[PDB]
Amino acid sequence: FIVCLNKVTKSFPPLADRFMNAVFFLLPKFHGVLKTLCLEVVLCRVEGMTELYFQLKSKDFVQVMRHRDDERQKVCLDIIYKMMPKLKPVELRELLNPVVEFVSHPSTTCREQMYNILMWIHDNYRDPESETDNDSQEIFKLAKDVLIQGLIDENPGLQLIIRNFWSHETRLPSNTLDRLLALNSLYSPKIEVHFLSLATNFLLEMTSMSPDYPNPMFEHLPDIQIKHSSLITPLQAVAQRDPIIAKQLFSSLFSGILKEMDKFKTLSEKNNITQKLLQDFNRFLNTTFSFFPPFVSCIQDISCQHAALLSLDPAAVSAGCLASLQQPVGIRLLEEALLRPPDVLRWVELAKLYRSIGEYDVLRGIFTSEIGTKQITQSALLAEARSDYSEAAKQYDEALNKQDWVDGEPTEAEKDFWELASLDCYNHLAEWKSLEYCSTASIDSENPPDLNKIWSEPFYQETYLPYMIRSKLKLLLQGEADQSLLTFIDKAMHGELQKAILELHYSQELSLLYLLQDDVDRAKYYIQNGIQSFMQNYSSIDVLLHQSRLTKLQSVQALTEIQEFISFISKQGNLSSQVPLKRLLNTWTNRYPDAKMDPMNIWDDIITNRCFFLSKIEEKLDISSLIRSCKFSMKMKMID
Amino acid sequence: KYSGRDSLIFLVDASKAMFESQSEDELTPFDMSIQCIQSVYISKIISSDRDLLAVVFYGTEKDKNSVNFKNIYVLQELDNPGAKRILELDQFKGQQGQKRFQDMMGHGSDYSLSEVLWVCANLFSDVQFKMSHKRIMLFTNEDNPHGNDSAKASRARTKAGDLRDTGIFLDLMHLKKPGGFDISLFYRDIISIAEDEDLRVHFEESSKLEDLLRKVRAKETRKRALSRLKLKLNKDIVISVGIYNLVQKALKPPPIKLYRETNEPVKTKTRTFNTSTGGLLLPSDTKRSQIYGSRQIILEKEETEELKRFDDPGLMLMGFKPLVLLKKHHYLRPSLFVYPEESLVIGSSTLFSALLIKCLEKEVAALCRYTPRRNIPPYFVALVPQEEELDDQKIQVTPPGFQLVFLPFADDKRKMPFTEKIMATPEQVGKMKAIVEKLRFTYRSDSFENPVLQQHFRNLEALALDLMEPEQAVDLTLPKVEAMNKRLGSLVDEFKELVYPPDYNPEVEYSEEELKTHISKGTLGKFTVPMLKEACRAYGLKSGLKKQELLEALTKHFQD
């Protein structure tokens, strides 16, 4: 019946009007191509009938869309396009969710129909901006988000269509300055890898209507001097290829337009434009999630070269530079901003930036003149400057607990610096027990619940989490049965708020924890992930930023030592006999982190890891007063 | 057709007048409807436990449906009837049940009468199985739901016509309430069964709801071929027929073993275990056997089925016999039915029809040799031509075709003892005739129900819905002794005096020494079989059941 009806109505739309109820009745009884025939029959007559949404909702029309079938999905999008002009906003909001989870779909015809219905839904829901309904202002926002995500898709014809639609008038103004201002409204942090190339493409596409394409010189085979269009077009073709030249081009265009506005504008309006640009840049730095090095660098660079954009949020700058490993540009921006109260915040952010790339001398230098203005802080920092990490931490904690100091009531920033420096000083010394209590005694009362309290106000994760986890780990490998991360880590492997953060940075620690309670199959994966993360971090670091690449490089010794231990334990061949153990001990005692060149944190990592590996080996199998002899020799080398 | 399952959707009103009723002993119509739906559920779960039933209250304050519609509630969706589904419904019976419904559902909240019909069609369209029939009963105590708004009436009529076109037949079982109006009104063009009736305006009683014959708690509906055989008129000319059974003994479903601790079914595993030496045995080292006296006959498994094979499966015609030679006394098995089928041989129906016509024209019955399966011995059958009989309502009661009649062999006929022929006389045969005429009876096939099956089904209902006591079935096969005695009169005593003479009323402890002494005493007398059995069992000797077995074995072994 349905086959014959579709065949008849393929050329005769007027029929099947009397069979609409019947075909709707049999619609949910099919699962194969007959369902596609039913939807096609429905598609034949959509305009001449009403109350269609009720019937589709009754027949779970939303669910059948999500099934993977090219013809069925295309027909579903087609009927949606046809019946959408008669829809209602409340129903359109429900209908919008299943069609937007479709951008990652192959068969670009479906995407083309998608973007067609989205262009329609964007043109009619633009609205005169009068407050009419929340749904009318929500479906438009959801659709606009998806449309920008369509600027980076494959099938360059579809991308060209979307670009033409976006660059048309009444959406992106043809005026140069207005277009530049409105380009910031098209961020869509879902796409930013190509954002600079697309922005400069939109900026330089308008110049093709410009009435200037002659030879921009007088010609004089010695010279082939040629018109403008032969220089702009290759510039764009190379800008959209790699990001560095695109960043340079966008920065230069921004600077040029900003400089040229000064003629055709007034100061009162100039202030509004600058404030809008600053707000847009703040939104850029706040909403960004996959921090792009060149994009962040370009934003901070154009910010640095303008007196109006120097007031950019220091917390956002610090977070972006730390996450994208682009410290120097943010450092320069903050230093320039500090050259013309909300000043200790800038100093705090600058200290946080400098600490990341070493240069501890400059850190201590700025932790005296600006942060401080007391007498205990100067003495503590002077003690810490020389290799004396006992008096400094002692007097830091003495100054931390006090009801005295009625001579100024030390500021909050100085107290935070006191706590952080005390933690750092405890880390330089081998006082992990003393470090853990003081690191965890800043979020709650005695016996604090280190659970979702650090995972709140991410400053906690930034400051106390690494020291606390390192202290607990080191204490556990010392030999103390004080298991508290095991439950914490195990229940932290849920969601992204406690796993992605715990895997982006801490991977060697996770590998040690997992091979601690032996499930070495996961420890191997964790250590490979850690090596890959280190490789990515090194790749992102500059080439002339010394004392920062060295710091990242000094951990490859520990990484390789743990990897070699995992390989040694996995193969049972080395477990038998004693010559593999003798060879391993000979190799380990031959290569050392050279003295007078490596700070003691690397020494402690290496020695503790080696001692723990020896202890773990001394559970499955002379081989005594020899393993202990190697341990004693390693510790003696540590002392020397 | 065969695999289709009938489906049913109820539609109970919940209006204000639907709840409030006259203040007497008569049930409120809501309780009547709930009791009737419960009865339909009970009838349809014991009989054909594969149909789909669902109940959709309309007019409620709440709402539950696939598409959000006001004042329509789908208490249950289409599924097989279950005990929990019945128990979910009986909580609305009575005044306390009425209050429970009011606090859980509500009443009033004027409806549309169209969205309810749309909802019913939705569940009808949501089934992934076949749909043999689609029906919607409309329990209502009102006949003119609308009239103040013609648009709603028109929409309801259009939706009803659409449902009828789709293949949905609704029939309202009208409820009668005090007043004077249940008139044929805006429901007449909606009843898609459109049952024939006088359509009398001034109905003053409950409508066709007692027609349910509530709780007909015994049925198992099915139609199947049961065989597909070839009727060989000769060696080379054969026709293909099917062998249906019209009447077949009904048995209660077999019990299922259960694990007591968890109340879950336990699978069984029957396997011939070792020979006290360990291991398992093949179907190839276990031959069948029989013993006759001292001779043991050993015979293989396949050879056992080989000795009972005579003919290939089919009906070998062997001649025609007059109907007057088929005596009524001879009867072995229920009579089967033959119909011409055209799946194995094309053209069987025409020859079959010609044979039937010319066989019932000459009042003769075909005689055949019947072999239903591969290895069954032949059994003669007289194919009696059964002519189609139809009622005035165009309803078939005896479908046309041939009917098997198993003729018994001489082995299956038993011989009676000699009896002396003593004949009655007039003047009491007349009295017997008067009594018989005074005890008239129009026997019908749909007269009696199996009392054992009825009691078992009622017990199961009581054990599945904790009715606190099983329903006592009225035993329809019990004679109405008092009523028939009163109807008879005093002529029974005239009978009794006439023939019956005046004086005719018609109405352990045993041990070694006692057995050693008793074998010489030789009685083993008042010694009972129960104690011989326990002696032979507890002592360990082989034992049987007949007395002589033990009396010989114990005597021969105990002394010798």
Side-chain angles (χ1 to χ4, degrees), chain A residues 21 24-26 28-29 31 51 54-55 57-59, chain B residues 67 69 118 121-122 124-125 127-129 155 162 166:
Chain A
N21 59 69
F24 272 118
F25 188 94
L26 304 92
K29 289 226 173 68
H31 299 112
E51 214 148 7
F54 273 169
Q55 325 217 357
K57 181 92 157 301
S58 55
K59 304 310 186 308
Chain B
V67 162
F69 277 127
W118 193 328
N122 289 357
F124 268 127
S125 162
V127 183
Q128 297 337 97
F129 303 130
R155 296 274 267 182
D162 201 317
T166 313

Side-chain angles (χ1 to χ4, degrees), chain B residues 308-408:
Chain B
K308 48 153 91 159
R309 204 183 40 92
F310 281 70
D311 285 2
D312 314 348
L315 286 141
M316 279 189 54
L317 205 149
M318 296 169 153
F320 297 82
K321 224 185 268 281
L323 267 200
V324 316
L325 280 178
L326 291 200
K327 289 158 204 170
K328 229 182 175 176
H329 329 118
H330 303 121
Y331 164 100
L332 280 195
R333 283 193 72 261
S335 316
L336 284 144
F337 191 77
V338 185
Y339 201 71
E341 71 96 20
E342 299 204 62
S343 286
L344 329 179
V345 162
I346 310 280
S348 279
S349 47
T350 314
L351 176 49
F352 192 87
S353 201
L355 199 34
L356 163 77
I357 289 182
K358 295 312 261 197
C359 211
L360 76 97
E361 262 212 14
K362 314 265 173 193
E363 47 101 31
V364 281
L367 202 81
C368 316
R369 216 158 61 189
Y370 178 84
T371 314
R373 314 212 174 291
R374 304 282 327 280
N375 288 255
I376 296 310
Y379 215 81
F380 288 97
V381 168
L383 278 166
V384 170
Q386 164 200 328
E387 162 193 279
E388 167 193 22
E389 214 187 28
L390 185 100
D391 298 338
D392 52 298
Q393 305 162 348
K394 308 310 146 207
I395 313 297
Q396 192 154 238
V397 302
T398 86
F402 276 53
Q403 150 205 347
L404 261 63
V405 165
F406 284 77
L407 299 119

Side-chain angles (χ1 to χ4, degrees), chain B residues 87-341:
Chain B
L87 286 166
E88 203 194 274
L89 212 44
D90 56 18
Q91 73 196 8
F92 298 131
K93 313 194 289 172
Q95 280 73 4
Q96 59 277 349
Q98 144 172 17
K99 216 203 77 38
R100 193 147 45 247
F101 196 91
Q102 294 278 67
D103 284 4
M104 208 261 261
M105 292 315 217
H107 63 145
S109 196
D110 286 43
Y111 40 76
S112 96
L113 192 33
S114 286
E115 327 276 21
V116 52
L117 276 170
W118 193 328
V119 154
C120 308
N122 289 357
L123 319 89
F124 268 127
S125 162
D126 258 324
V127 183
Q128 297 337 97
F129 303 130
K130 310 238 287 181
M131 292 315 257
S132 277
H133 295 72
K134 301 172 261 279
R135 300 235 311 169
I136 297 175
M137 301 96 88
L138 189 67
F139 301 82
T140 315
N141 90 9
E142 81 170 344
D143 44 304
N144 204 20
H146 305 265
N148 36 14
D149 195 0
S150 309
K152 309 312 283 175
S154 211
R155 296 274 267 182
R157 283 168 284 197
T158 283
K159 187 49 79 159
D162 201 317
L163 255 67
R164 192 193 318 118
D165 271 31
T166 313
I168 287 180
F169 298 138
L170 69 141
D171 52 315
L172 56 101
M173 307 181 171
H174 204 197
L175 283 319
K176 170 96 211 84
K177 31 71 182 175
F181 64 108
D182 68 312
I183 316 306
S184 276
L185 271 193
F186 156 36
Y187 283 130
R188 303 158 271 186
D189 48 88
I190 306 303
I191 314 143
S192 285
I193 196 144
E195 257 310 299
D196 206 313
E197 195 39 61
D198 181 65
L199 210 82
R200 194 51 31 181
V201 165
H202 188 69
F203 269 18
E204 267 321 294
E205 90 287 351
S206 93
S207 302
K208 48 166 290 319
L209 190 43
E210 86 302 326
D211 69 332
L212 281 176
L213 216 172
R214 262 175 306 204
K215 318 228 183 92
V216 288
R217 220 179 290 97
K219 190 161 49 215
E220 206 141 336
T221 86
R222 178 34 53 229
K223 151 83 183 284
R224 227 175 58 169
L226 194 140
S227 266
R228 239 168 243 282
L229 253 54
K230 330 216 291 181
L231 170 54
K232 319 180 215 301
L233 285 92
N234 203 1
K235 154 202 71 63
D236 61 330
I237 166 177
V238 303
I239 84 187
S240 185
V241 290
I243 303 176
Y244 308 83
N245 59 332
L246 275 201
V247 53
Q248 171 75 332
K249 182 183 180 63
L251 319 88
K252 65 175 201 305
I256 309 188
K257 317 295 241 312
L258 288 182
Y259 189 34
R260 175 177 283 132
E261 266 95 11
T262 89
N263 271 6
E264 271 301 31
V266 53
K267 94 183 45 153
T268 184
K269 279 189 177 358
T270 278
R271 47 180 178 240
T272 321
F273 273 140
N274 39 358
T275 83
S276 324
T277 71
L280 263 46
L281 311 94
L282 313 96
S284 321
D285 66 334
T286 78
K287 328 161 146 294
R288 266 64 185 168
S289 180
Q290 277 185 19
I291 278 188
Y292 299 108
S294 164
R295 280 313 272 278
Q296 171 172 130
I297 283 155
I298 169 64
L299 203 152
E300 276 97 11
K301 156 74 172 184
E302 288 284 353
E303 276 183 14
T304 313
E305 281 214 88
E306 195 186 295
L307 45 84
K308 48 153 91 159
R309 204 183 40 92
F310 281 70
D311 285 2
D312 314 348
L315 286 141
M316 279 189 54
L317 205 149
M318 296 169 153
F320 297 82
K321 224 185 268 281
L323 267 200
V324 316
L325 280 178
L326 291 200
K327 289 158 204 170
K328 229 182 175 176
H329 329 118
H330 303 121
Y331 164 100
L332 280 195
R333 283 193 72 261
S335 316
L336 284 144
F337 191 77
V338 185
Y339 201 71
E341 71 96 20

Side-chain angles (χ1 to χ4, degrees), chain A residues 97 126 163 237 339 355 369 376 448 479 492 515 538 595 609 636:
Chain A
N97 293 307
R126 206 141 49 220
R163 160 174 324 129
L339 266 188
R355 151 175 279 254
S369 288
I376 170 66
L515 73 87
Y538 200 144
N609 287 303
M636 271 315 317

